């Protein structure tokens, strides 16, 4: 059938990129988003897919992702432009039967390498699928401004950074009890940064890249966007607070402890111990 | 009749949540809003309400609210999404004849506990109704950013905080002469925080939760939103001022005194005395 | 998930009713439309359905329709109004496990008998499902104006009426080779008219009710609407032609024969023989 | 409060005039519509009404309409223009305490006689209120094209005209069982035509003015518009039928009888007897 | 200043052409409209006008139109397209100081003869200005469909044609008491047809061109459009009536007489006498 | 005529208030705007004005403003709401023949004192008219955020404040060479603050109220808004600069001198001398 | 043909100015944008261009730009207003056959000097065309806020400023490896600043004007806007960082080196050496 642009998932992709562009998080082509779909999501639209789609092999096969469809932003595409031309800026792809590569069924442009960052996403989808028994479906990278700024002034240490972020808005502890993972700065678009981020994604829905940005995960687009927005709201508040000379008072350790108990979550111990 | 979504009060709910999302005050599901309606408001739409609505008993009955209808945001709902699907994100409810519980007449989703925060709102509506001879109709919680930030650097003291806020924009004294109430940080969603906020609401239209957010009241959605926006505008200005090294000059006590006299309001004495 | 109104099938229902209102075919509450859905269509929206939906038993069970979901216009609803309030004017229903009745999962108003015409539709869906090996999914009734007018002047005879309609636009023969079924006038909303229409639906995708309107079937909303529009376009042309004193020339029998052969359809013999 | 233009009843007025303009029924300033409101409808908008409104006395007081508010089209206003400037083209009025006259609370322009046709409407509202125990609230005049045309060729006789209209679409008998009232042509805007129409309105929801137009009544705007549209749809079909040389077959008397019995209405006897 | 497209008079031009395109009256480039403006209308927009505008001399000077501005449709422009590109399809022009020619201040395209029909319009504006003491400001030509059709079957005689049109809707007599002027068919775009139409415009706001269309005048765009629409509504009704075999009854002479008296107009005697 | 809401000046009022609300400058009812119109602007709309308008006398007559019309925001109105209901939130007024008072011709609500701040505006319009030979037409008050913040940290001295603002963006000197006037804090809405601001307006298009906001003037809405936006852009940059520890380098006096010479303006000497 | 406003390049101009206005970068008339087009871009619209266009000679001819068309913002035009009236605020121009001057084919207003800044743009287009073998087509000036602020606190030295900007977001090095050029403050609109900027444009796509703004270049509007937005995003982050007391850690020299190698760019040596 027609109107694929108005499908729930193309509409959701437009919402999340547009929202992020409006937040100031995705200058130029900075940012990427992919969403894991089910065959039944795309089946009504078969009509629209190439009879002979482009195939791109993967360097490390991912059999966990076999026969799995996704919608994704193209590499080099601007979040700002997605609402204006969804088909030019998004692609629907499907991993083949042994996960040795993927076919581009719909969307995007005719270049060599329209989805350069997709191998890195796939690696992280795998870890998140194992970590959550198949609940996580989204991987989102953006350049969340205050979170970036904090990476120049806070210790680049999971425990220290998580603790400040929890302190900066009450609900953070409940939204990311497992804390934010962190990496040293690394060269973007490399195997190493892909593998290293995926390893952090084993124990974190949210990972910081210092002097660059954030990488997050969730079961739905709303939940992923809302995770990033919550930590970035904290960061925004902390930037103000530090800029005014630092905390005179804050949430105390035993207050953070009682928060986790009431909401039934177990907070990252290292961050609590501070 | 049909078009309930276009009714004055569903349209007002969409306006206030949308406005607050755009201000940056309601990340994720952070925020709640309820508005007290009259039977005549909803009577034309009876057509649309469940013949057998869900009933939720209250832990402490509220006979002052007997047979009273309200429109409300669901728990877990995102302010951002209200404009996109008013019926999914809002509910119309009605307190039964002895105020022992409430029925969900319209809207929201099918979960256990679609309106978790409504008991706390009701407690505060009661106090505001007594405090204003029935003029206040709205209770609004949001995460007003600069007000949050100030809770890490200013003394958490009604008099001190009120005085800075009055100084930060001229008209604040006239808009909230009774000052802002404050509480210690407390675990959200608990009886204690509900009761404690309601007790502050006896003498304040506006109450701060440190490291979390604000809770405000008013006769209309515009007036409530406009109360919060005014104090948050002050806070925004103060964040700048403190960040530049503090006040070199400001509104003086006897200037604040003359302001209250000209506009016919009596300002919180403790705040004036500073 | 939210945005059920923007789902492909609610959007399709709005398109088809709106289009028909604009054609002049559905004055007041004249007209009905139902579309057979699959479980996977509505599964993403489960969120929105009543935990305790209304049950309406059927007078004659239909086990062929067991566990089958549909979207439908309410009885008494105006096609014109569907675009303005989809949820008030449409309902999603699901036939129970032995086809003894149906539950209203979503939409419509709180009256006794919100879907009076649904038993008649179901009977015809059954015949169309058997007749097409499960391809037909839509049943649509509207008051197609020129087709109505022709029922006062043409012989109320399948063969005669089909032949004029084929002659009135070239492509009609290919679109409905099996011809239009016809009934004597009967009292609307009765078992008899329901059963009699369903019996015509055994051999026809399109059935005339003299002095009243048309009843049609198809695999998609577009195809059903387009079937009715094609026969009503023919009728419109014939009204003009008869009004100008009748045909001086027309499509000849052996031309209609060659048409069926080229397009690979076998035309109703009785209509060809004229 | 503000947004009176978006109130349910101003929105309904815009819908009904716009719909009628699109049907081709209201050239120039041809047509008028008034809707009886309740005090509670306009009470939220008091804010917007003149402190010293214009008063227009009535020639014959109507105490049945005492203290009753209405929304109305201005005299000389074009249906086409209502959607473009609701406030210029509509007025809200209120009949005083002994029904000796009315005040214009809102809308319309500053001329002498902005609502020339309102006395005639009021007379008919009175009869319809008595005739329906207060259910009818709308009086609508438009120049329904095919109904006008039929007044040059059919006998200007209630029984004869009603019978043709019933025959021209099946559901007409059920929608107006009491038939259409008719008057001789009379000079428009006169007491006589006002009184004479009101007298027909004692026993008819729908009244024909030969060579001019129709005058109808109903409990809601949708129901009134839908009554006129149904009879005008019949007329449209009959114009076609007569233009093709007349009925070869039609609905028979005993078929019309069975229709009234099944739907529980008693049809105008004189029309049945034909 | 900017936004000239949103000025009242460009907006009015878009409304009237668009409305006429939707009525079916202006296929292709069939139709023309010009509106006489005042200097104060265009003065705020001076900003937008060519410093060196194109000058087109007139064959017969019109000193009555000296220094007078107008907005106009270009020759060869499609009514349908005006809403899509007002500036391409409309022009603002101004007659020079002794009425020997006109300058194109704004709009239209760069061809030889962008306003071919403007001399003919000007001649008719002159007569209408003299005839109405300066009240008429619009000249509008369109191909009103039923009025065209009637020119093949009715006597091409002012009195006969006026009388049928008055009979075809009650209010026609009041809207055009002076009747419709008529001409023999003539070759379009010629001096003769221009002069002959202007001479009819001495005593008529509305003039028929047989087998072609209508030419009308009024003080405002609404009033002119509404004059044409009223006579074309009559014609539409008469086409139906004649098509059904002619009038069985109609408005009688003494009824038409009483109509003119009540509304204070003196009807064309020749038409009354029939 | 109708469509007054779409007139150039109501549209301009909506643009300027909406723009200012979006900038964050007009919380609640904070802000006021008035624009001086000409009789010819409102003359086409006479149709819409009260036959008996409300009269409000002035305490000090202003014969310079005799017979002068203005469009204005109501007191207590929210800038945010103007786009939603222009007529509720704006008023058109006209000063009587000896400038002893004004009549409200259109718009606003029915209270005592719908335009409380208009006397103060009028006083300043007078001074600006004398100061610019009748070129200035707008007076605008808003709570420009960074300009407010700077009033707590910079010396409240015309010369010092002007100099920083010139330094903070290159073009400021050219946009306001005469500098910004300043007052001590004063109680708002008083004669004294009205008179004192008007006296500053003798030599300044822009005046600061410490701890409150700004008051500016210009020949058009765009030019006034653009003056305030330019100084507030400077302030925004300075807030950043001061917050980072102050200027390391800046525009030098002799650079500011050369700027004024090149653009042909004479800069406030006191500010240059610093 | 018509619809020139909807052409790809007028639509692109509206997008880029509107986006920049929304970013807060173009107060009042601050900013300019020009885009080099090809003859084939404008050829379909020839229809719309003046038969006798205004000619403006250049002071220094530019034969490299001979016969070259451009679309441009007018001098004195507000970025904010472009979306509201593209034709008033943009112009299409074409350089004559020996590059001695240019003709204004379309758009803009009738003043002396509608494009004051175009000579300066042309000089820079020339250098960018030589520098990139004809790939660059855009020159854009705006007042990027955080970049302006940084010019008061950072050393005004290409190497130092480039290095901070690279450090402030990872991808900056890849987006502008050649670094940002800088000039001393100079008087705007002068030959000297025009020539000096063009000389920087020999080796830089991006040039800072201290205390004023930025001047950038690119092959497309998106790429140019995205270059400025990227450096301004860095600046925004640095303002925060410096405001919080400076970097505790950052991207290291050998990390910046490895970045350039991986992406295949050679970074400005002077900036690397720091
Ligand atoms: Fe970790
Ligand atoms: Fe207190
Ligand atoms: Fe058959
Ligand atoms: Fe009767
Ligand atoms: Fe004549
Ligand atoms: Fe001064
Ligand atoms: Fe350089
Ligand atoms: Zn990145
Ligand atoms: Zn909260
Ligand atoms: Zn039917
Ligand atoms: Zn009428
Ligand atoms: Zn013509
Ligand atoms: Zn103020
Ligand atoms: Zn500049």
Curated annotation (Swiss-Prot), chains A, B, C, D, E, F, G:
Keywords annotated in UniProt: Cytoplasm, Lyase, Metal-binding, Rhamnose metabolism, Zinc
Active site: 117
GO MF annotations, alphabetized: aldehyde-lyase activity; identical protein binding; metal ion binding; rhamnulose-1-phosphate aldolase activity
Pfam families: Aldolase_II
Localization of this protein: Cytoplasm
GO biological process: pentose catabolic process; rhamnose catabolic process
EC number: 4.1.2.19
Cofactor binding comment, as recorded: Binds 1 zinc ion per subunit.
GO cellular component, one term: cytosol
Residues engaged in binding Zn(2+): 141, 143, 212
Swiss-Prot/TrEMBL induction comment: Induced by L-rhamnose via the RhaR-RhaS regulatory cascade. Binding of the cAMP receptor protein (CRP) is required for full expression.
Cofactor entry: Zn(2+)
Effect seen on changing residue 28 to A/S: Severe loss of enzymatic activity
Pathway the protein acts in: Carbohydrate degradation; L-rhamnose degradation; glycerone phosphate from L-rhamnose: step 3/3
Family named by the database record: Belongs to the aldolase class II family. RhaD subfamily.
PANTHER family: FUCULOSE PHOSPHATE ALDOLASE, RHAMNULOSE-1-PHOSPHATE ALDOLASE
Described purpose of this protein according to its UniProt entry: Catalyzes the reversible cleavage of L-rhamnulose-1-phosphate to dihydroxyacetone phosphate (DHAP) and L-lactaldehyde. Also catalyzes the dephosphorylation of phospho-serine in vitro.
UniProt subunit comment: Homotetramer.
Protein name: Rhamnulose-1-phosphate aldolase
Source species of the chain: Escherichia coli (strain K12)
């Amino acid at each position: 059938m027609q109107n694929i642009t108005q499908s729930w998932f193309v509409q959701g992709m437009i919402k999340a990129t547009t929202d992020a562009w409006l937040k100031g998080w995705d200058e130029r082509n900075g940012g990427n988003l992919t969403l894991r779909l089910d065959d039944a999501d795309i089946a009504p639209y078969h009509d629209n897919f190439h009879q002979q789609p482009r195939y791109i092999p993967l360097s490390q096969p991912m059999p966990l992702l076999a026969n799995t469809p996704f919608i994704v932003t193209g590499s080099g595409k601007f979040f700002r432009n997605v609402q204006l031309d969804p088909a030019f800026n998004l692609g629907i792809v499907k991993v083949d039967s042994d996960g040795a590569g993927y076919h581009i069924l719909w969307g995007l442009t005719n270049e060599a390498v329209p989805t350069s960052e997709l191998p890195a996403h796939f690696l992280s989808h795998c870890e998140r699928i194992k970590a959550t028994n198949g609940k996580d479906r989204v991987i989102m990278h953006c350049h969340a401004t205050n979170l970036i700024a904090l990476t120049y002034v806070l210790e680049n240490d999971t425990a220290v950074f998580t603790r400040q972020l929890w302190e900066g808005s009450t609900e953070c502890l409940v939204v990311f009890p497992d804390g934010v993972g962190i990496l040293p700065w690394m060269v973007p678009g490399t195997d190493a940064i892909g593998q290293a981020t995926a390893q952090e994604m084993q124990k974190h829905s949210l990972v910081l890249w210092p002097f660059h940005g954030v990488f997050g995960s969730g079961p739905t687009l709303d939940e992923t966007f809302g995770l990033i927005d919550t930590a970035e709201k904290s960061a925004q508040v902390l930037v103000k607070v530090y800029s005014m000379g630092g905390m005179k008072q804050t949430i105390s350790r035993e207050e953070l402890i009682a928060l986790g108990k009431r909401f039934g979550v177990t907070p990252l111990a290292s961050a609590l111990a501070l």
